[PDB]
Amino acid sequence: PVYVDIDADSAFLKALQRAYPMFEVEPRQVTPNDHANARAFSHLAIKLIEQEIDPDSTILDIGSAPARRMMSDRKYHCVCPMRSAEDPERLANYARKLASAAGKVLDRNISGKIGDLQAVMAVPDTETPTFCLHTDVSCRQRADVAIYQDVYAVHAPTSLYHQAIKGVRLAYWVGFDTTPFMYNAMAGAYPSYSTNWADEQVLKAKNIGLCSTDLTEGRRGKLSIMRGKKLEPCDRVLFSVGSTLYPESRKLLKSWHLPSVFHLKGKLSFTCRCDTVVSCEGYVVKRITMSPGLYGKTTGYAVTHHADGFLMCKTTDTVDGERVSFSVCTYVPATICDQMTGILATEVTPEDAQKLLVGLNQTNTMKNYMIPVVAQAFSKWAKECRKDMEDEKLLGVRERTLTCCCLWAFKKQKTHTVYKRPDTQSIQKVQAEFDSFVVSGLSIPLRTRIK
Amino acid sequence: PVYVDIDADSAFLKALQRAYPMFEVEPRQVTPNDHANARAFSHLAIKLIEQEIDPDSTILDIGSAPARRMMSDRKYHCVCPMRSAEDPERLANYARKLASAAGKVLDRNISGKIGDLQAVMAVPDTETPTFCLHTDVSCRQRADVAIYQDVYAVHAPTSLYHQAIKGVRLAYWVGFDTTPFMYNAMAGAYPSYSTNWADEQVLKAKNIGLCSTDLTEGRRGKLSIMRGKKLEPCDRVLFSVGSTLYPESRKLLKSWHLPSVFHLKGKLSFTCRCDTVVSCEGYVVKRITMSPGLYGKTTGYAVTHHADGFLMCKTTDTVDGERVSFSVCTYVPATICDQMTGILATEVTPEDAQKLLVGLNQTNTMKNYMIPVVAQAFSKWAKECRKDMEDEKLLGVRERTLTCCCLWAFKKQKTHTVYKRPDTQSIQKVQAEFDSFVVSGLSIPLRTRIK
Amino acid sequence: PVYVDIDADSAFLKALQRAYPMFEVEPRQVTPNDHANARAFSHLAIKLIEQEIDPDSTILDIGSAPARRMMSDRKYHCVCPMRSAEDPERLANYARKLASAAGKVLDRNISGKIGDLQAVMAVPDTETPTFCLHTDVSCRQRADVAIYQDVYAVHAPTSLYHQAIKGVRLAYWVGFDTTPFMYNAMAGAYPSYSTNWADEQVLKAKNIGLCSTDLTEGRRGKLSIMRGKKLEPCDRVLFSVGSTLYPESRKLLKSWHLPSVFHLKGKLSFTCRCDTVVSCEGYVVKRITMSPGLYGKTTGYAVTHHADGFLMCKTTDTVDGERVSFSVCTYVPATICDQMTGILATEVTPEDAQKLLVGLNQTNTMKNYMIPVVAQAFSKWAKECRKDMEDEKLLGVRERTLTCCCLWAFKKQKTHTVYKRPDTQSIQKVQAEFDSFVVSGLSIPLRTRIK
Ligand SMILES: C[n+]1cn([C@@H]2O[C@H](COP(=O)(O)OP(=O)(O)OP(=O)(O)O)[C@@H](O)[C@H]2O)c2nc(N)[nH]c(=O)c21
Ligand SMILES: C[n+]1cn([C@@H]2O[C@H](COP(=O)(O)OP(=O)(O)OP(=O)(O)O)[C@@H](O)[C@H]2O)c2nc(N)[nH]c(=O)c21
Ligand SMILES: C[n+]1cn([C@@H]2O[C@H](COP(=O)(O)OP(=O)(O)OP(=O)(O)O)[C@@H](O)[C@H]2O)c2nc(N)[nH]c(=O)c21
Ligand SMILES: Nc1ncnc2c1ncn2[C@@H]1O[C@H](CSCC[C@H](N)C(=O)O)[C@@H](O)[C@H]1O
Ligand SMILES: Nc1ncnc2c1ncn2[C@@H]1O[C@H](CSCC[C@H](N)C(=O)O)[C@@H](O)[C@H]1O
Ligand SMILES: Nc1ncnc2c1ncn2[C@@H]1O[C@H](CSCC[C@H](N)C(=O)O)[C@@H](O)[C@H]1O
Ligand SMILES: [Mg+2]
Ligand SMILES: [Mg+2]
Ligand SMILES: [Mg+2]
Ligand SMILES: [Mg+2]
Ligand SMILES: [Mg+2]
Ligand SMILES: [Mg+2]
Ligand SMILES: [Zn+2]
Ligand SMILES: [Zn+2]
Ligand SMILES: [Zn+2]
């Protein structure tokens, strides 16, 4: 019996039960959290990871929040480099909770944990069994398992290699699905988790999930010094989970979209296998095994299975008054996708598609703020399919036109919707051979306060 | 079991229960208060804050109403600078209640409270454990927790820094949502709390919630000495909560719209994290942690999650006979917003939208005095969406026109409505690095009366 | 259990129960009073005031009717200057009732009351504990509470200052709502209380609540010596409550529309807070706290919260044969206002609006004699809204036209209806800084009769 802080009548309960059939999920609502579903998924994921691994194993918790591991019988070594502004609060919460359980919880090594915390406070660079202030690449604690829970600030191959050279043979990554960033979308939603993310350039849009614009009265102006003739995704994105905001980097996010098999070639060499073991409406748990030596061959292909529909479409919005178009991604429940199979046989207008989608949403199966764009997406998709049926080609042929050179062109059709239906797979060519991994943050007053 | 002075059949009861799932909310109506909902929310909020914090903590109550902390087992130090015209009544009520419970309540430190009150009356500058006549920046009582309950007259960063340099590590702010003032609206409503606020310039309007106009026949006159060619929001706004009026300053209101993480850089430096822990139909409880030292990096982005729809729209009204347009904001129940998803797929006239909204309101889900403006808003929003669909742009392009200089302009489209649907987030760029905080009010007759 | 002399089936019972939730209101009809609702409200108001205040307090009763305080256990000092023509009757009734309970009621100080009455009859200037013949500004009895029950003949700031310099710190005012006289209406109704008031100039109208006209054939005559080219509200108004008539002065009526906070600056200075604690369909109880010393700042704004709709509209009537137009105010039940929200989305003729209002009135929710003008009002309001929608302006602009001078006029639109919907607030700028308060009525044989 695992108790999750979500509403009893919530429809995410069924999705969580299907995602974790080996547990008895029961709702025990105690707080009005606006990101309750994400926390519930993380809780169930760490429970599953603990179930899978050997009790005698020692687990590195990279980018840890130590207050969450303090009621765990497992042997966690929490790596806390204090690199984020929210970290001091987490460390203070850990210290307060340890003090509150100092002589009242017996078999959770609370005395050992407070001793290690005081030792790290005394000598910053000491490596205690349960705590340290180092990073993933500077910690010296050898272990058998590594866990990354909502860690997006590390390059995946470098961190994984640095764990592997320390004897780590199993790694676990819990996070948001990295597929929408492999498609290079400008903005997007994980609607089941009340999560909206956007490129920094489109934060002033009007109709995406995460934006804020102003009311204006029109001008042929807004002159600027930046010749922004092109609107393309840049590295910095903003995540909003419920109401908490997190900046992310696209390279770091995409690094965690690892292939099925890859090779880390350093002073030591490792053959690694990445596998998505849990997938619930945009939240995934990935298992990475690492074995010394080079074995087999790598194709460099990462595959995402779509239990629910995944949409990326073009949207026309108004950013700071200026009308632009950019790609927006979302997830659509598989029941909604199945109920639109017959409608998309014909060309449908976005208004008719929206009306049908609202009909299928009756309570609501999917969030309504994403219904318009989805409708638009579907409409475009339907039209494009007709185009393909209308302009049928010949087998074994590919029409090419010369351009007065030893080089030839052809026509690229317009594609305004990528629609991965339920039971399909996205396949992306990514790097699979990594060989270049060669590429003191606590203050005295915080030290005094922790004591 | 927490008892709230609201009607048993009130629909706000379900909203309060959802906002506070950790309590058993029971209606016990004893007075015909016209701002009963706001008082009920404040009561439940202080109960939640008391639940969260350690009993041995000492709590600064900034801008306190000491009569409300008098039946509390917690250790409150009430800071009462007596800068409001409603403060003498509150102090007299506190003294009268203390006298009425001097020898009837045993375990609430009533004797201590009367002793401290008499001590401050004797020597005004004395700093007693439970009472003082200083301000937030002149009080000397060190504490661990600070509470701001309906305090809008202080600059947030300066006050928080002055608490932090006194050892305060946790602060709580209970008050009306600051999002409508981040959008620079001229007038607005919190309809669930019977609250209407307006800029001082539009108090003579006709159809906003808080206004009063006269009956006129129409003249080509009203000549004035002030060249008012622009109608823009000014600093002073008027709040009417039920029937009690409060003047507010826009800058002080907006200062409390703090980012997720920020830095206070003074003689001491603090890394602070602001989090909205309670959000109920326009009334919020925010939790601010403060930790010494500078950690991490700040983006300067403040995020509001919209459980219910938030609307800002253009309204045409008559102020002192003169027809003008200004922005008006409001909150719309999420069920109403969901029920209008299908209708807003096409362009709808404001009259048809109003009739539909009246239909969905049957008892009433939302206040009727806001239905017209909301209807108008929806209509405009629908229209604008279609325009965006009609004038579709190209990906990665941004049309710009030169003006015989090293500058290029473009066309800014129409925005008469900002509609944040349920499960979306507003994101605003605000200051996150604060480093300039360097920027005796009791008379003898009141001293004699208090004794 | 409070018993009210009203009909058991009266619909005012529910309104009174909502206005006084702290009491059990039971109808005990004993007389066919035509102003039974007003008397019932006054009875419940004095009960609530008595409940609120400390039993050991001494209560000034300004402009008292001593027969009503005579079965009161509280310590009332009745101030009876005998300036009204209905006062000798009240004094005789008081003496008769005292005699009738001289040796039959033991614990109501009847012997003391008759002793004080005989003392004042002997020496008119003596200040006895329970009775005096002075005014509010000439009484010398110091007290802690003052009560004004249906007192409209005194300037509010001067009377309140004279009470405050006598140690009075709490004052209560029970009376008809002063909002209709802040809007400067010519005639009006409190229909729940069967009350109609009119300006003296329109007493000869035809279709207002309080008027009487004659039957005429119609002539091009009625010459007069007064160039009455203007019809404006003058000071004198006539109230008819049921069938009892009372002349009132507009200045004295409006003086009691006090701001939320104000300052009395005389030889002593007081900071006063006015708050409306009871509001029932036009009858209000206001609480005024007074504290010595000047504190805070005053805005000068008085706010009225509308639980029911408030209408002021232009009506065309026939006064003494001459067709004129003037403003008429009234209250509309909130259920009627809510049921007309959808209808007022479009332009509706007064006849269709009247038929709809008669339909919603089925027993009757509102008085029928007020339905026509209300209908007309709604119609005009609807039309005006359309105009505001039709003539949409630009944000941040205000069109002004020069007149060959350093002055610029503009166009003032028509306003034929002020409609304060339920859950709105009227805000009026009134005086809040008062500093100029510097601005023997019993005969020998009434004395002999009283003995
Ligand atoms: C550290 N972190 C956490 N999340 C997600 O946001 C949710 C809350 O993230 P949180 O760090 O605010 O949890 P907190 O310590 O405040 O404790 P709680 O409020 O009781 O939950 C988590 O469930 C994650 O799914 C995160 N999401 C992104 N994109 N980036 C991050 O760094 C990140
Ligand atoms: C001090 N203050 C209180 N409020 C809100 O108005 C409501 C009443 O505010 P109040 O100060 O009038 O309460 P009072 O002391 O009269 O006791 P009560 O009548 O029994 O409640 C509160 O619930 C607040 O939500 C306030 N609202 C604004 N905008 N500004 C303020 O300063 C302010
Ligand atoms: C003194 N006075 C009383 N009223 C209202 O008129 C009603 C009756 O006023 P009343 O003075 O005629 O009561 P009376 O002494 O005759 O005893 P009763 O007939 O049993 O009630 C009261 O309920 C008041 O609401 C009053 N109304 C106005 N406008 N002016 C006044 O001076 C005034
Ligand atoms: N290079 C690095 N090596 C190890 N940890 C790092 C790191 N860069 C950032 N981090 C840490 O990663 C953390 C992400 S916040 C993590 C919260 C916690 N893991 C949870 O499950 O809720 C930050 O606290 C930051 O300190
Ligand atoms: N600079 C300042 N420092 C501390 N308090 C201040 C202040 N400026 C104004 N105040 C106080 O803030 C109060 C707001 S009224 C507060 C009422 C009370 N907190 C409640 O919960 O109902 C006023 O009484 C005023 O005295
Ligand atoms: N200046 C003044 N000071 C005190 N009382 C005054 C006054 N001017 C008029 N009054 C008194 O106010 C009274 C209004 S009739 C009041 C009736 C009584 N208060 C009731 O509740 O029914 C008159 O009797 C008149 O004598
Ligand atoms: Mg959150
Ligand atoms: Mg497998
Ligand atoms: Mg109020
Ligand atoms: Mg949080
Ligand atoms: Mg009568
Ligand atoms: Mg109040
Ligand atoms: Zn380590
Ligand atoms: Zn202090
Ligand atoms: Zn007297």
Numbering used by the authors:
A (entry chain X), B (entry chain A), C (entry chain C): 3 to 364, 376 to 452, 458 to 469
Original authors' sentences:
NsP1 is the membrane anchor for the complex, forming dodecameric pores that associate monotopically with the membrane in the necks of the spherules to gate their entrance. Enzymatically, nsP1 also has a role in addition of cap0 structures to the 5′ end of the positive-sense viral RNAs. NsP1 possesses both N′7 methyltransferase and guanylyltransferase activity and reverses the order of these reactions. Each nsP1 protomer is built around a methyltransferase fold common to SAM-dependent methyltransferases with additional insertions (membrane binding and oligomerisation (MBO) loops 1 and 2) and extensions (ring aperture membrane binding oligomerisation (RAMBO) domain) that contribute to pore formation, oligomerization, and membrane binding.
To investigate guanylylation of nsP1, the second step of the reaction, we acquired structures of the protein with SAH and m7GTP in the absence of magnesium, a cofactor necessary for nsP1 GTase activity. As expected, we found that both ligands occupy the active site in a state corresponding to the postmethylation reaction but prior to the m7GMP transfer to the nsP1. However, the definition of the ligand and SAM binding site densities drastically improves, suggesting that the ligands are more stably bound together and that this induces an ordering of the active site. However, there is a slight rotation in the SAH ribose and base, resulting in an ordering of the αC-β4 loop and bringing the side chain of conserved D138 within H-bonding distance of N6 of the SAH base. R92 and R275 of the neighboring protomer move in to directly coordinate the alpha phosphate aligned with H37. This contact provides direct evidence that oligomerization is required to complete the GTP substrate binding site, explaining why nsP1 monomers are inactive for GTase activity. However, it is immediately clear that the substrate is not correctly positioned for nucleophilic attack by the catalytic histidine for guanylylation of the enzyme. Surprisingly, attempts to capture the m7GMP covalently bound intermediate by adding 2 mM MgCl2 and incubating for 2 h yielded exactly the same configuration of the nsP1 active site substrates with two new densities attributable to Mg2+ metal ions. Mg1 appears to coordinate the oxygen atoms from the beta and gamma phosphates (Pβ and Pγ) O2B and O3G, respectively, and a second Mg2 atom appears to coordinate the catalytic H37 and D36 sidechain at 2 Å and 2.3 Å distance. In conclusion, the presence of m7GTP and SAH in the active site results in a metastable conformation that cannot transition directly to the covalent transfer of m7GMP to the catalytic H37, possibly constituting a regulated checkpoint of the capping reaction during infection.
